[PDB]
Amino acid sequence: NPALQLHDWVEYYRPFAANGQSANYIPALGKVNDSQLGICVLEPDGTMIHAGDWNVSFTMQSISKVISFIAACMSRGIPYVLDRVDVEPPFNPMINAGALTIASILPGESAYEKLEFLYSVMETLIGKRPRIHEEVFRSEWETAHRNRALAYYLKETNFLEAEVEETLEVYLKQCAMESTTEDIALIGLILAHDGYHPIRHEQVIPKDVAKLAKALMLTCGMYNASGKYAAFVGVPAKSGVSGGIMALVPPQPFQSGCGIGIYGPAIDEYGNSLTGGMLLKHMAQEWELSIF
């Protein structure tokens, strides 16, 4: 009975949020409640189970990287994308440097138009246009030294296809798209089904793009803990420094597969939700979710 388990596990793991804390280098993100922990799982017949702070909005942050990657592949095609970004753990698209490159190749002659495409791909997946947290965006834009450094770096080396301020606008706004555990569990369910939207009953991401997305998640989705998660959790997963984890299991419980949206704002030293990570590992182990 997964629902009861998830309630107990959220109860159990919530206290460990004392071992890390919220993000600091984006100040509007340092202001969030640190004991928060929530989870949603979505099945392809539309059954969902949630527990904890499952319905608190947060910014997607690095989660948005898999969206823009997918959006860039749908727009320019895989070959175009893989010539400018690497798939090895030219920079990796899960990393800021690769993600900045990806932002700069989104179709359009301005930031606004690069972002309209992104937003419109995102509507396709979650069924609404997403809210941009301007407060979070504003504070990142003031303080984005490292990203402007990288972006000038990429531009010097011919890896950008937009101007710096433009690319940084698109990148910092995608990071500030807001989500619930619910929206990320749906994007995760869709990826589990190879770009097939199991509620809308249509193909929303091409299957090969969705395969490339899953591989990058398993391989580089959890920053510098990716091998660890692969070894002890075994589920393709993508974290964001705001404490979100998007994970998924391909088609125990959840036989037809599932999407998972987790939120736990206290993060660890690797940059991943502390309590969200603990919970995901528990589920993976208890319900034998590992895909190898």
Rule CB under 8 A: say whether 227 interacts with a copy of itself. Answer: yes
Tokens of 278: 């603990």
Closest CA to 66 of 95, 105, 23: 95
Binding-site member from 48, 118, 218, 280 for a copy of itself (CB under 8 A): 218
Measured CA to CA in angstroms, residue 246 lies from 109, 113, 266 at distances of: 31, 26, 16
171 is in an annotated binding site: yes
Nearer to ligand ONL, 139 or 281 (CB): 139
Nearer to ligand ONL, 9 or 91 (CB): 91
A 10 A CB-CB count for 200 gives 12
- Both tokens of 3, joined, read 């629902």
CB of 155 to a copy of itself, least distance (A): 25
Q: Is 66 a catalytic residue?
A: no
223 is catalytic: yes
Q: Which of residues 120-159 bind ligand ONL (CB under 6 A)?
A: 140, 147
**Taking phi first (over 0 means left), then psi (-120 to 50 degrees means alpha), and beta for anything else, what does residue 97 get?**
alpha
Q: Based on the shown chain and the rule CB under 6 A, indicate whether residue 265 belongs to the binding site for ligand ONL.
A: no
Among 66, 132, 213, 241, binds ligand ONL (CB under 6 A): 241
241 is annotated as an active-site residue: yes
Instruction: Please list every residue from 68 through 97 that binds a copy of itself, using CB under 8 A.
Output: 86-89, 92
| Least distance to ligand ONL, CB of residue 32, Å | 13
Determine if 266 is a binding residue for a copy of itself (CB under 8 A): no
**Which residues, 6+ apart, have CB-to-CB distance to 24 below 8 Å?**
30
Smallest gap from residue 267 Cβ to a copy of itself (A): 18
From the list a copy of itself, ligand ONL, none, partner contacted by residue 4 (C-beta under 5 to 8 A by kind): none
80 assigned ligand-binding residue: no
The reply to whether 140 sits in an annotated binding site is yes
Is 119 an active-site residue?
no
Among residues 13, 22, 41, 65, which one is catalytic?
Answer: 65
Counting residues that bind ligand ONL (by CB under 6 A) gives: 8
Catalytic residues, by residue number, are: 62, 65, 171, 223, 241
List residues forming the annotated binding site: 62, 96, 140, 147, 171, 223, 241
Q: Applying CB under 8 A, which residues contact a copy of itself?
A: 86-89, 92, 211-212, 214-216, 218-220, 224-228, 230-231, 234, 236, 250, 290-292
Q: Applying CB under 6 A, which residues contact ligand ONL?
A: 61-62, 96, 140, 147, 175, 240-241
List residues forming the annotated binding site for substrate: 62, 96, 140, 147, 171, 223, 241
